[PDB]
């Protein structure tokens, strides 16, 4: 993967992040680890490794936000079903 | 997060996937778990949960590909440095 | 998997956490999302879903900490 | 962390793997990326980097398997 391809990948993943933060009732702190890295698309002189790390944090964070959203919606129904079966013992 | 927002997120993550597969020397099997799910952006009638799952697999896979790419480039230099220090004992 | 097997997996992953936190120069905050969940091995009456989620946050936190360490050794 | 601590973490994560694979109706292929790496606890002469990577693939594989199971219980 070339450096210009990685910069373009990082630019688009930041477009995904902004898209996500624009949604209804989303976790606005989801990307806090990516922000700690302070490696951004415009930092064209930083290393291929720093940019790979930033894309890693973005992908990872998007997946963790999907997981949290599921564990807190369907996970709740599951917890409730389990509580009801218990009750029905 | 509304269903139309999640479909739009899934559509864009598929744009990221296609972007990545277009790069130089990339792992073309990186998204094999997302393809097993067979949940796609055009499947507008499938559940919010199936779409969240598909975005999870895409984010996760992009991050795993960054990890593999790093473990196989910088990881190699690190392994080699460690081998040389050993040698220098 | 059965609930007893999952509580046992959660107990062992907490053993992994305590082992990692006992290592030299490690990120002591690596598991902060798991602590936010407040679902622990001893909470035997909480849901299978709450426990699967806690095992998810522990596995994920360990892999994140290995990645940070690898992305940082590389500089 | 030191190499001996990392080999010990890798040994325990392999204990977690074997424990999970011993559970009822689990995904027996969950750890296939770790097997592709072929870096095991007994490979004491392989690099710290090869071992961090194997712990990464085991943590990640466990969290992926918890997620699959949660995304699938939800249907
Ligand atoms: Ca910044
Ligand atoms: Ca398909
Ligand atoms: Ca607690
Ligand atoms: Ca092997």
Reading the block at residue B76, the tokens are: 């190699």
As a whole number of angstroms, the distance between CA D39 and CA D25 comes to 26
Taking only Cα atoms into account, the Rg of chain B, rounded to an integer number of angstroms, comes to 18
Cα within 13 Å of Cα(A83), Cβ side = 10
Q: State how far the alpha carbon of D51 is from the alpha carbons of A71, B37, B68, B74, C7, in Å.
A: 31, 30, 13, 14, 27
As a whole number of angstroms, the distance between CA A13 and CA B13 comes to 8
> Method used for this model?
X-ray
Which of C2, C29, C43, C53 to mutate to test binding with chain A, by most A CBs within 10 Å of its CB? C53
Q: How far apart are the first and last CA of chain B?
A: 58
As a whole number of angstroms, the distance between CA A29 and CA A11 comes to 20
As a whole number of angstroms, the distance between CA A59 and CA B58 comes to 8
B11 is in an annotated binding site: no
Report whether D67 contacts B42 (CB < 8 A). Answer: no
**Neighbouring C-beta atoms of residue A45, cutoff 10 Å:** 6
Domain count, chain A: 1
Backbone angles phi, psi at B8, to 5 degrees: -65, -35
As a whole number of angstroms, the distance between CA A62 and CA D47 comes to 31
Reading the block at residue A38, the tokens are: 């302070």
Question: Which residues of A does the annotation place in the binding site for Ca(2+)?
Answer: 38, 40
Helices A48-71 and B48-71: crossing angle in degrees, nearest 10, is 150
B59, B64, B67, B72 alpha-carbon torsion, rounded to 10°: -140
Reading the block at residue D70, the tokens are: 């949660």
HEC-encoded secondary structure of chain C: CCHHHHHHHHHHHHHHHHHHHCCCCCCCCCCHHHHHHCCCCCCCCCCHHHHHHHHHHHHHHHHHHHHHHHHHHCC
As a whole number of angstroms, the distance between CA A67 and CA D68 comes to 10
Domain with C75 in it: 2-75
Q: How far apart are the first and last CA of chain A?
A: 58
Dihedral-angle region of residue B69 (phi above 0 means left; psi in -120 to 50 means alpha; beta otherwise): alpha
Q: State how far the alpha carbon of D75 is from the alpha carbons of A75, B55, D55, D68, in Å.
A: 11, 17, 31, 11
The answer to whether A79 contacts C47, with C-beta atoms less than 8 Å apart, is yes
Nearest to A53 among C49, C53, C71 (CB): C71
Which residues in chain B touch residue A61, judged by CB atoms under 8 angstroms apart? 59
> Which CATH number fits the domain that encloses residue D36?
1.20.1270.110
Pick from C4, D27, C43, B66: which is nearest to A13 by CA? Answer: B66
CA of B37 to the centre of ligand 2 (A): 7
Reading the block at residue A79, the tokens are: 């917890």
CA distance to partner chain B, nearest, from residue C55 (Å): 17
Q: Which residues contact B74 (CB under 8 A, 6 or more apart)?
A: A49, C70, C73, C74
SS3 helix, strand, coil % of chain A, rounded to 5?
A: 70, 0, 30
Block residue for tokens 């694979």: D21
As a whole number of angstroms, the distance between CA B19 and CA D9 comes to 36
- Give Cα B35 distance to the centre of its chain: 12
Element containing residue A7 per DSSP (H, E):
helix A3-21
As a whole number of angstroms, the distance between CA A51 and CA A57 comes to 10
Report whether C2 contacts D24 (CB < 8 A). Answer: yes
**Neighbouring C-beta atoms of residue A26, cutoff 10 Å:** 15
**Neighbouring C-beta atoms of residue D64, cutoff 10 Å:** 25
Ligand nearest to the CA of C32: 3
Which residues in chain C touch residue B67, judged by CB atoms under 8 angstroms apart? 67, 70
As a whole number of angstroms, the distance between CA D50 and CA D35 comes to 13
Class of residue A55 by CB neighbours under 10 A (exposed 0-12, middle 13-18, buried 19+)? buried
As a whole number of angstroms, the distance between CA B59 and CA A55 comes to 10
């Amino acid at each position: 993967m070339h450096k210009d391809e990685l910069l373009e990948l990082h630019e688009q993943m930041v477009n995904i992040k902004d898209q996500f933060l624009g949604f209804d009732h989303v976790d606005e702190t989801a990307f806090a680890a990516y922000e700690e890295l302070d490696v951004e698309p415009s930092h064209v002189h930083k290393s291929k490794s720093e940019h790979k790390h930033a894309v890693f944090l973005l992908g990872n964070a998007l997946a963790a936000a999907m997981s949290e959203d599921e564990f807190s919606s369907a996970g709740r129904i599951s917890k409730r079903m389990e509580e009801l079966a218990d009750d029905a013992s």
